[PDB]
Amino acid sequence: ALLGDLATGQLTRLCEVAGLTEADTAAYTGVLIESLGTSAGRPLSLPPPSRTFLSDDHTPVEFSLAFLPGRAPHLRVLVEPGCSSGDDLAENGRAGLRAVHTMADRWGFSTEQLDRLEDLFFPSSPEGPLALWCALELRSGGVPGVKVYLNPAANGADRAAETVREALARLGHLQAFDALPRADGFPFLALDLGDWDAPRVKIYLKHLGMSAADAGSLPRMSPAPSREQLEEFFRTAGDLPGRLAGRPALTCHSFTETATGRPSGYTLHVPVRDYVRHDGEARDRAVAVLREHDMDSAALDRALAAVSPRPLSDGVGLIAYLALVHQRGRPTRVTVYVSSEAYEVRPPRETVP
């Protein structure tokens, strides 16, 4: 009945799917509760603590599973740690930074890149749609990977490009901005914190009206991802033979080194929840993509039931996004983003225009 208890239960069942030990599960449920602050004790009969853009129903929690062939999926959880401060973006951001720095102190990792950017992304009177989200990679051992998401539009949407360019310059990526493809917006900048072999600075781009061919041509990494695989993924996720006309697809461009001046990674994010009548269809598309890339779709079916007992066709939005992930020298990866639905289940649609 409480927000933290629903989220804890969902995470526990997902940890089972990920094959984590009971010890690691208990550790990470505790981390999740800490991340939610006072909102963890919030009755679900009351409104969401914030009008957060993290999920459609404003649950300040979202899960995702990263699939590799011949492996259990990697489990991650995204949270808005300052959600108890509500829609006061300045205080929301301050509270989120405090939670990240508490994690950093606990697990002994650097916030140098983040502190270098703080003044750019946390001005006195910030604009929306977010201040700070944090994703935890729930690794065996109980020490998670930490990822922080910041708002390029914190200084106004018309200054988002300016903010991203200055951020990349401060991080030593002096060619990265000009290497990006053109876009219709800059929804997020993200950083890898903690133990990472090659920590990324990730630039997310919004594209209105993307086609399947666009999806395969937007990469800027070397080596170039297979265009055919990207077009097929886009068509499957959007059910096309055709442009993604509603919720726009996103691309994410990861920079791990400064020598090439170009990204080392490319991810295509498709908001499948706006292109299906209900989650029965979104699940069908998800398992098709997983099976195309030799990943265990049965684990996804178990993950959906772990998050929600409802019939898939009774609503839409449980599967929020599908993503195809390319990273230099790493195997191709598929990520499924799964909603908590703590506050509402969106009704099925009778058609998709």
3-class SS letters over 114-149: HHHHHHHHCCCCCCCCCCEEEEEECCCCCCCEEEEE
Provide the β-strand partners of residue 251. 205, 268
Nearest to 205 by CA among 182, 186, 219, 220: 186
Write out the two tokens for 319. Answer: 């599967």
Write out the two tokens for 263. Answer: 């990204």
What 3 state SS string does the chain have? CEHHHHHHHHHHHHHHHHCCCHHHHHHHHHHHHHHHHHHHHCECCCCCCCCCCCCCCCCCEEEEEEECCCCCCEEEEEECCCHHHCCCHHHHHHHHHHHHHHHHHHHCCCCHHHHHHHHHHCCCCCCCCCCEEEEEECCCCCCCEEEEEECHHHHCHHHHHHHHHHHHHHCCCCCHHHHCCCCCEEEEEEEEECCCCCCCEEEEEEECCCEHHHHHHCCCCCCCCCHHHHHHHHHHHHCCCCECCCCCEEEEEEECCCCCCCCCEEEEEECHHHCCCCHHHHHHHHHHHHHHCCCCHHHHHHHHHHHCCCCHHHCECCEEEEEEEEECCCCCEEEEEEECCCCCCECCCCCCC
- The amino acid sitting at 234 is F
CB 231 within 8 A of CB 213: yes
Separation of alpha carbons 166 and 174, rounded Å: 9
Residue 57 vs residues 48, 60, 331: alpha-carbon distances, Å: 8, 9, 33
Provide the β-strand partners of residue 226. none
Q: Which residue has the tokens 């200084």?
A: 155
CA neighbours closer than 13 Å in the CB half-sphere of residue 251? 26
CB count, 10 Å around CB of 242?
Answer: 11
Write out the two tokens for 258. Answer: 């400064």
The residues spanned by each domain of the chain are: 1-353
Nearest to 67 by CA among 4, 132, 117, 17: 17
Separation of alpha carbons 249 and 265, rounded Å: 17
What technique determined this structure?
X-ray
Write out the two tokens for 132. Answer: 């700070």
Q: Resolution of the coordinates in A?
A: 1.5
Separation of alpha carbons 20 and 42, rounded Å: 27
